UniProtKB/Swiss-Prot annotation, chains A, B:
Protein name per UniProt: Uncharacterized protein MJ0764
Record Pfam families: Cupin_1 (PF00190)
Membrane-spanning ranges: none
CDD domains the record matches: cupin_Mj0764-like
Length: 109, 109
């Protein structure tokens, strides 16, 4: 076989997509598409998070803060153990990657 | 200040861009744009690598393998301590993120 491992993420999605693609000892990488009016579950981050926004606008509410908007061209860091909500209110299509390191299991102890 | 930390990456770049944006205890995230005919330095990966390709086509040569081509919509894993070369031969503009975890310093011991 090859040295590398390949994953594919959906291009030009126009529907809600939650792709939990990479899940290794060292990292998790997900690909998310949220059409306008959709949102992800409210939850506390289970690792250190970076949100790589490649299309549209995200409305991110953390803890007791007012909602903050981030557009394509932003990478947003959310610390471990922080209450978060991701919504797409303001764009036709919001597309981002979620990078988590280390794997949540490493922080569960 | 805010709970989150924000970074910006260059959108719609048409020139060579090597943006070493995120560099934390836990992760590194870079944003790279290679116009046609450009390439990155040949080197051995200093952590576990994932290449998130969002535009164009990458020609990736690992160790003694023939060059392999990967297009937009691929995430490519390259293990730690592997000789690699990234080239853009076949597309006008190749754009990818590089996710590295854990931080290289953690593997340097
Ligand atoms: Cl990994
Ligand atoms: Cl981090």
């Amino acid at each position: 076989g090859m040295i590398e491992k390949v994953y594919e993420f959906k291009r030009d999605a126009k529907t809600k997509v939650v792709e939990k693609l990479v899940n290794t000892e060292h990292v998790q990488i997900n690909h998310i598409v949220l059409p306008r009016g959709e949102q992800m579950p409210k939850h506390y981050s289970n690792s250190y998070v970076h949100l790589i926004i490649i299309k549209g606008e995200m409305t991110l509410t953390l803890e007791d803060q007012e909602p903050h908007n981030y557009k394509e061209g932003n990478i947003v860091y959310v610390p471990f153990n922080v209450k978060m909500l991701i919504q797409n209110i303001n764009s036709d299509i919001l597309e981002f990657f979620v990078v988590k390191a280390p794997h949540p299991k490493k922080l569960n102890a």
